[PDB]
Structures are given as structure tokens and as C-alpha cells.
Amino acid sequence: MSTTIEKIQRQIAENPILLYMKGSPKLPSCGFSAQAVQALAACGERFAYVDILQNPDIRAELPKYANWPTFPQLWVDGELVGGCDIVIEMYQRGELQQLIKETAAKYKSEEPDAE
């Protein structure tokens, strides 16, 4: 199929906790993700993130595969949650870290992200 999404899906799936945002050297979230990134790290533990508002190719095709025209978009166990607003809301909800915790714990050690 698409000579990048196939790779990307393998990548999203492999990463325990994944976040797509813009990884500018000055700011590793140069977009909307700027507010969301804070929430994720705040709610759970450490997470993996992919620069995409910066990469032209990846920015276009891959987001469309999940839902969004582009990003930010948050992925838990390689499954889309939502990047900009969704992260903040679910952050406040607590459910985000609930997912992250369980996912992080099952992928790594006893990651006590949420609790």
C-alpha cells in the first residue's frame, strides 16, 4: 500500500506510548501539541513522540490514515486518541493516564503512570 503508512503503523504499534507533534529543535512540539504534550507528561509517565508537523510527507498521508488531516494526534498502544484537545480533556478526565498507565505498564515494567 502506501510506501510509508505501512512502516508508520508498524512504528506506532511498536511504541508503547506515542505522540505525534512537531519536533522543532527550538521546541519539540511546535504546533497545537504544545498544550497537549504538557498534559500527557503530566498525567502519565514518559512517552515517545514523532515529529510530523515538520515532516511534509509523514504530515500528510499518515494522519489521514488515523483520522485527522494532520496532527497533533496521541496514540496509546499504537491506537489513536486525539492530539490537541483530546489529550487535554482526557488529561483532566484522568482516563488518558488510565490508558497510558496500563499501556505503559504492560509494555515496560510496572509503570505507575496514573496510579
Swiss-Prot record:
<dbReference type="GO" id="GO:0005829">
    <property type="term" value="C:cytosol"/>
</dbReference>
<dbReference type="GO" id="GO:0042803">
    <property type="term" value="F:protein homodimerization activity"/>
</dbReference>
<dbReference type="GO" id="GO:0046872">
    <property type="term" value="F:metal ion binding"/>
</dbReference>
<feature type="binding site">
    <location>
        <position position="30"/>
    </location>
    <ligand>
        <name>[2Fe-2S] cluster</name>
    </ligand>
</feature>
<dbReference type="GO" id="GO:0006879">
    <property type="term" value="P:intracellular iron ion homeostasis"/>
</dbReference>
<feature type="binding site">
    <location>
        <position position="71"/>
    </location>
    <ligand>
        <name>glutathione</name>
    </ligand>
</feature>
<dbReference type="GO" id="GO:0015036">
    <property type="term" value="F:disulfide oxidoreductase activity"/>
</dbReference>
<dbReference type="InterPro" id="IPR004480">
    <property type="entry name" value="Monothiol_GRX-rel"/>
</dbReference>
<dbReference type="InterPro" id="IPR002109">
    <property type="entry name" value="Glutaredoxin"/>
</dbReference>
<dbReference type="InterPro" id="IPR014434">
    <property type="entry name" value="Monothiol_GRX"/>
</dbReference>
<dbReference type="InterPro" id="IPR036249">
    <property type="entry name" value="Thioredoxin-like_sf"/>
</dbReference>
<comment type="subunit">
    <text>Homodimer.</text>
</comment>
<dbReference type="GO" id="GO:0051537">
    <property type="term" value="F:2 iron, 2 sulfur cluster binding"/>
</dbReference>
<dbReference type="GO" id="GO:1990229">
    <property type="term" value="C:iron-sulfur cluster assembly complex"/>
</dbReference>
<dbReference type="GO" id="GO:0045454">
    <property type="term" value="P:cell redox homeostasis"/>
</dbReference>
<keyword id="KW-0001">2Fe-2S</keyword>
<keyword id="KW-0479">Metal-binding</keyword>
<protein>
    <recommendedName>
        <fullName>Glutaredoxin 4</fullName>
    </recommendedName>
</protein>
<comment type="similarity">
    <text>Belongs to the glutaredoxin family. Monothiol subfamily.</text>
</comment>
<keyword id="KW-0676">Redox-active center</keyword>
<dbReference type="Pfam" id="PF00462">
    <property type="entry name" value="Glutaredoxin"/>
</dbReference>
<comment type="function">
    <text>Monothiol glutaredoxin involved in the biogenesis of iron-sulfur clusters.</text>
</comment>
<feature type="binding site">
    <location>
        <begin position="84"/>
        <end position="85"/>
    </location>
    <ligand>
        <name>glutathione</name>
    </ligand>
</feature>
<keyword id="KW-0408">Iron</keyword>
<dbReference type="InterPro" id="IPR033658">
    <property type="entry name" value="GRX_PICOT-like"/>
</dbReference>
<feature type="domain" description="Glutaredoxin">
    <location>
        <begin position="5"/>
        <end position="107"/>
    </location>
</feature>
<keyword id="KW-0411">Iron-sulfur</keyword>
<keyword id="KW-0963">Cytoplasm</keyword>
<dbReference type="GO" id="GO:0016226">
    <property type="term" value="P:iron-sulfur cluster assembly"/>
</dbReference>
<feature type="binding site">
    <location>
        <position position="59"/>
    </location>
    <ligand>
        <name>glutathione</name>
    </ligand>
</feature>
<feature type="binding site">
    <location>
        <position position="22"/>
    </location>
    <ligand>
        <name>glutathione</name>
    </ligand>
</feature>
